[model samples]
Target: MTDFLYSIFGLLILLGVLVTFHEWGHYWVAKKLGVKALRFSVGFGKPIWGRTNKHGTEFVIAPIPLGGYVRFVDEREGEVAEADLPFAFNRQQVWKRILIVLAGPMANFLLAIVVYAAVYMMGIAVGKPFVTNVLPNTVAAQANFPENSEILSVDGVQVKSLEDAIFAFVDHIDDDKTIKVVVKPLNQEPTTVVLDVSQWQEPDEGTIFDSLGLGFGRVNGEPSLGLVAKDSPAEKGGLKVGDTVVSVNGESISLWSEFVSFIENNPGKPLELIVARDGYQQPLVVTPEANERDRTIGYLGISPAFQGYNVINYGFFESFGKGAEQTWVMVERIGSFLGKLITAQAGMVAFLLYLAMISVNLGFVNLLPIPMLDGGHLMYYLVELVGIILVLTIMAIALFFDINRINQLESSFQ
Candidate 1:
């Protein structure tokens, strides 16, 4: 319950921050354009707390914190009194109106870039992908692979992290008839092992990692004392913080990956665990819990401690460029998945990521046509852009109704 609650709280905080930044972009741009911003709100529903700015803009924090919007004195949504017609959003020039509509998304993009830049500047710790164990009778074992071996390359491609290693192997297996994997044992040097593609087997349905029979050494370190999950096999068996697991089911455990392999393949089965604590060896019996996806395996309900790994950091200019590149990559990746989902080639989870990315992407998308966005609105006066608006009432009605359909489409996906 505590873990679930913490996850929910973290997600809420992330959503709130993203939404606030998005709405702020619109509000700031509108104010700069001399537009009458009626409300700048974070979240939807009734206001929890708010303050009316001197400019009459009602800045508010609303009850539900999923997302937010900026309500401008626009011509379409409501009647624009004759006296207020000049300040109405829809009455403004096409480019100005475009800026206003674009600002919110622009803010989200900028926020993501800034967040990425900060995270990069601070550095993120990661380790090289290494194999900790090879399960007996598994594909890895059939290939005669050694335990505690570091993966150097797969299918002629050099591998780095676990993600890279997995993708490389999966791609080769899916593409070719056989795979040549190069690995280096902890004490020994590198050696190549050949896997016959025709011998491949699917572990089970709905299991992402099982398709690959390799087990990773623990990427993180030993679990800290209070951080161990309650009701987990480790906790139930009297495992404590600072207790390093030496072996599982009588097999000597040398790396984090080995420990997981023992747990994963022996799900729902009782096993003996040898622990080294304060220079003493203690044995405990534990039964791994059955998991939904990996039907043949179980989980111990614990996460490895993320410590001691080195983080990569970059300078301001490099970080900015990298951040922008990353943002665009994410956008393209998300856009591709969305296209697939629309074509029914992808699942709802992909669609969910699409929506989440949109909320983040909204911030950046809005700022492009500046002047109405913080950047766009600012760009207008400098560019000497003069535009006009000839409202086609019938066309406006059709367009507004069409946009409502788009909203409905998005809502259906959600």
Candidate 2:
């Protein structure tokens, strides 16, 4: 319940910030261009708090934080007094009105770029593009991609991290052609390899990483118990943080998958856990609970603790450049998936990244010359509105799947 409320609150705050910035662009531009701004509001609906400036412009905070508008002194919407005739929005020249309407979306775009740039300047920790654990019988196997090879480039595009390589690979996916990848071992000459993707299928989530069967190894040392969930499981049976499971049900265990498989296969059964903690071996018993979605499987109610990630920071100017470049790259990548009904792919795996994609969506979505937005013929804006809604219905079905996957991921931890 707390988490649910937090999500709503967080979403509102984000929307509020975006809306204010967008509306401010119009309000400021209009006011500067000899237009009288009647209301500079951060939200819609009945105003809860408002102050009328000395200049007669009302600054308001209202109930509906999701939407906001800068109500200009426009004669088209209302009767303009003789004193305000020159300030009427409809009286403005076409180019001036265009500037006013364009400022809103331009502000959104600019805000997005700044948001990403700040995140980049703060230094994001990402690993290098060194490959490991390439699954057999997949694209990586077909290419004979060397294990631990430093990925240099994909389709001639230089890569920085595994993420960069993946993005490049996805960007260069050719339906009837091969993907060229260049890699080199330490101190070894680089070799170009062609990965067969002629038979590659476009996934539902719009990503290709998982389809490529690429996996990264745990570079951070030592796996240990991180969090033990309450009730009928780790908490009731007895388990502590940093406890390393030596074996389950009297059998030895190493990989987390092995432990998971054992627990899953032996549901509703007593399992003997041999845990190594503080230089001592401890015996523990736990009865697995049936998985909520898959009753045949077992749930231990334990969280897999991962090693800390290393972050890379950049200088002031360096961060801005890197940030701008990454945001543009994302915009380009997202633009690729926009025109069509994007099917599922590995793209939806990262929840936060997808959330960021939504911001990217909000940034340019208003480019449509809507009647309310632009002072123009309704027909010209209708086409833009159509273009906008054309994607709305397509994404509805896609979001169901994405939300389901995100729910499953969050449920794992909760």
Candidate 3:
């Protein structure tokens, strides 16, 4: 329930602020370009708050906070008195009209840059990029990758953390490129691995990390069992405290997440374990109970490894640069993760990436030439008049489908 309210509140702030900036960008530019603004609104529906100014502009806050609008005095939309004719939108040059429309999405992009800078300054704390264990029959499991090695760089992109490595690797997952992965093993010289990921199979809507069996290594290279549940699979399987798990079902286990995944995949199945005790290798067997949602999954009552962190800091200008950098990386990464959206699912880094992604998308869609408008070009008083009609045309058709869905929701309610 608390989460429900938080979601509603978060949506309110996100839409409210985002739409306000978007519309204001249009409003500000339109007025500066000698166009009339009859109404500047935050949200849709009836006005909850309204104020009329000397400039004859009505500022309002509406009940529905999904989106807002800047209602200019347009001869095309409604009648304008002779006095207001000079300030009418249709009366203005077509190029100036496009400028006003283009400002909205551009404002979203700018807001994203600012939001990114603020978040970047706060800094992103990430796990060190280390390959603990790679599962067999997978891409990373090959001789190209080694166990207990830290990823230094990939394709010349320096990977400071695990998230950085994930981004670089997955961004080009489908390309037919011979990729380079540089890793540093303890007391071993740095080695470069040539990778060809095009042949790797991708799960329809899951992470590339999971598909390749790339485990999230133990934090700070310090691995220790946190807790063992009573009568649980691990506990029953002789997994006592301080007993490090080496393999599950003959599959090597390193990160706590890999262990968790192993259990989740083997519900109601026997687990062949090889664990490391005080000074010897011990073997055990345990069967996981069936999951409630799907019996095919294994249920194990266990805790994850404790992760320690190091603070990441950036200066003022550094934050801005990182913010812009963060935005572009997400934009490209999003292209790879299009089939599976991890942000809404989980992953704080993915969430931040998502926030930055949508802002860029909002700006990008406005730039495409959809054959719905007159002209398309990159310019001063920049304008993207082409796609506007296409978007609205799609929405016009969407309204009918939306109404059909709404009807079912209301009628289906008992």
Candidate 4:
């Protein structure tokens, strides 16, 4: 419920801001180029907020918030007075018309760059990927993946965090070639292994790594409790949050899986625990509760504790360059992703990144040479002649593909 509300609020803000920039692009260019813009709006439908500028332009905000337009004083739309004839948009040169139309999408692209730049300057926390376990009968299992190893690189791409490594892996998802993964085991030298990606498929549950029999941990992830649910067994046993499970039943507990497996297999059984807390090692007892839905499994109502991230900072000017680079990277990535969108279809920090992606997408899409679009307008001015049939056919094809993809995504979930 909370997630749904956040998504709605975030989407409203994202659309409101981006639409304003887009319309402002058209409005600004038109005004600067001496073309008369009678109305500059950030949305469609009835106006909720509005004001008339000294230039006689009515700036408005409407309730729809989904789209916007810049209305220009055009001779084609109606009869223009003698005084406004020079300011009519239809009277402007072809080059000026082209520039005015191009400005909206350009504004979207620039907004993406600015957003990326701001994020880069603020810094981001990244978590190093550590292999916690390798399941049987999968790529990681066949590769003889070592336990407690940190990922150094994937397919010649050096990665600093788990998310980076995953994205790098995703880049090669369609390839039939074996991907090379480099890992450095604790107190050992780094080694490279071949990852058999032939049988990999995007799953409907868990994560992409899970299909490859891989699991991730943090650089300092250990058998510790990050959360101890109230009235749960962990709390009843006097186990507090941040308590490291040093040993269970006098047996050493080194890895997170070892503790998990023990508890999972010993439901309804009291277990002695040696927990390392703030400057002290103490004993405690906790009994796992049998799962209500699946009695064979156990529930402890506690989560793992890990030191997951390191913040990377950047200089003011350098951030802008980095931001531009990031925007270009997104452009390419989004382009690739869209190509597969018909076959494959798919988040806060996630929401902001999503905003940047959609911005670039909007810009790129509008620039495509198609009638009734910005690029099409430029084409018309240069050399263009098409009717409603071509435009309608294109829109119909797009709608058909969208519906198809939506069905695929929905069925995949089912």
After superposition, the stretches of candidate 4 with alpha carbons farther than 4 Å from their true spots are: 1-5, 79-82, 131-159, 162-221, 226-229, 267-269, 277-281, 289-297, 303-305, 333-348, 384-414
- Name the top TM-score candidate: 4
Q: What are the candidates' C-alpha RMSDs?
A: 14.7, 13.3, 16.0, 13.2
The TM-scores of all predictions, comma-separated, are: 0.49, 0.60, 0.52, 0.67
lDDT of candidate 2?
0.71
Write candidate 2's Cα lDDT for 257-354 as tens digits. Answer: 57777888988898998988998999989889888999899988886565324455567767667756766777777677676645122222233344
Cα lDDT of candidate 3 equals 0.72
Best-to-worst order by lDDT is: 4, 3, 2, 1
Worst 10 residues of 2 by lDDT: 343-352
Best by lDDT: 4
User: Going through the candidates in order, what is the number of backbone clashes in each?
Assistant: 21, 8, 2, 1
In model 1, which regions exceed 4 Å deviation?
Answer: 1-8, 65-67, 74-92, 125-127, 131-310, 341-358, 361-414
Residue 278's C-alpha lDDT in candidate 1? 89
Candidate 3 contains a number of clashing pairs equal to: 2
- CA lDDT of 364 in candidate 1? 43
Model 4: per-residue Cα lDDT over 1-414, one tens digit each: 899998788888988888888989899899888898988888778788899978788899987787888889766676677888888888877768989989998999899888877776776767677787788877788888886788888888988777788898889866756789888875467999888777766677877888787788645447887878888888888989888889999998787778988889999999998989997999989999998888788878888776455555778878888878888887898788878977011114556667887888888787767967777776677774368998999999899989989999889529
lDDT of each candidate versus the true structure = 0.69, 0.71, 0.72, 0.81
lDDT of 3 by residue, 285-342 (tens): 8778898888887887666455344336677978888878867776676556654754
